[PDB]
Amino acid sequence: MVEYTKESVQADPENWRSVDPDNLVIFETTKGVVYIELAPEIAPNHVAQIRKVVRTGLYSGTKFHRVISGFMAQGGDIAATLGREPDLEAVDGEFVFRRDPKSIVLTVINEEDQTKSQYTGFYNGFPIETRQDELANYSEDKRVESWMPHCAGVVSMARTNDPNSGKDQFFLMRDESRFLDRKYSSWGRMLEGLDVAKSLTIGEPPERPDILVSAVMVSDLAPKDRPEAWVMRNDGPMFSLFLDRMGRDKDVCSLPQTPSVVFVSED
Ligand SMILES: [Mg+2]
Ligand SMILES: [Mg+2]
């Protein structure tokens, strides 16, 4: 809706947060590129797992083997294309995190007095849903339960009925899917490439699935080769204007994603 230049973003740290290259993953697919920001504060062990799997090279060539319109695109089944079970352990479910409301502060969408058991907002460009902050007054850890809801753009971990079976398979959220919330380990967000995810070939499985051609951690690239990503600061005034413009009656998943931009290197 609004295009932001690299110059305008770099000059304005009040409104733009630079993404850590070790939190930035490039998924090159047969429908285009997806840039994912990892969310270590939301799912620390899953974020470590994704870095680990990416760095094995084993995601390369994995299919998007389960793609459901209006839901998600699932990929990352290494065994299916490697031809053998990979040397890879499962990761325990991380469906919620314990948030300190004095430390990790959500930007609310509506400033009106809250009256529900839960609310949503943004932190570092990630959508967040939470139990009420007032519970932290008396909880044993002075924290409250929060999670990253499965809005379009979120990236999460596939699993079986076993909550600890997440390992390699992931899904790219194509549409708001709140029935997944608190049941699947969301761990990242597509800064760019939601449209790419929404274009992956549908099927269970597709006859001829799209492919995750390569995955790269940006921190593993030489400095001059690194794309540079920025995410609008939810607590800054440009985001206030964005909410004004888009509608503050909307829940976090009915808004667009937090404005984000990825700039690739010159030749
Ligand atoms: Mg769709
Ligand atoms: Mg409250």
Residue numbers in the entry: 0 to 266
Article sentences:
The crystal structures of AquaCyp293 and AquaCyp300 demonstrate that AquaCyps fold into two domains, a classical cyclophilin-type PPIase domain and the NIC domain with a novel mixed alpha-helical/beta-strand structure.
AquaCyp293 is a monomeric protein based on size exclusion chromatography—multi angle light scattering (SEC-MALS). AquaCyp293 is a highly active PPIase. Similar to the highly active human Cyp18, AquaCyp293 shows very high kcat/KM values, which range between 106 and 107 M-1s-1, and the maximal differences between peptides are only 6-fold (between Leu-Pro and Glu-Pro). AquaCyp293 thus resembles other cyclophilins in both high PPIase activity and low substrate specificity. The residues Arg65 and Gln73 of AquaCyp293 correspond to Arg55 and Gln63 in hCyp18 and are essential for catalysis. It starts with two short 310 helices and continues into β-strands, which provide a structural link with the β-strand of the N-terminal extension and a β-strand (Ser259-Phe262) of the cyclophilin domain.
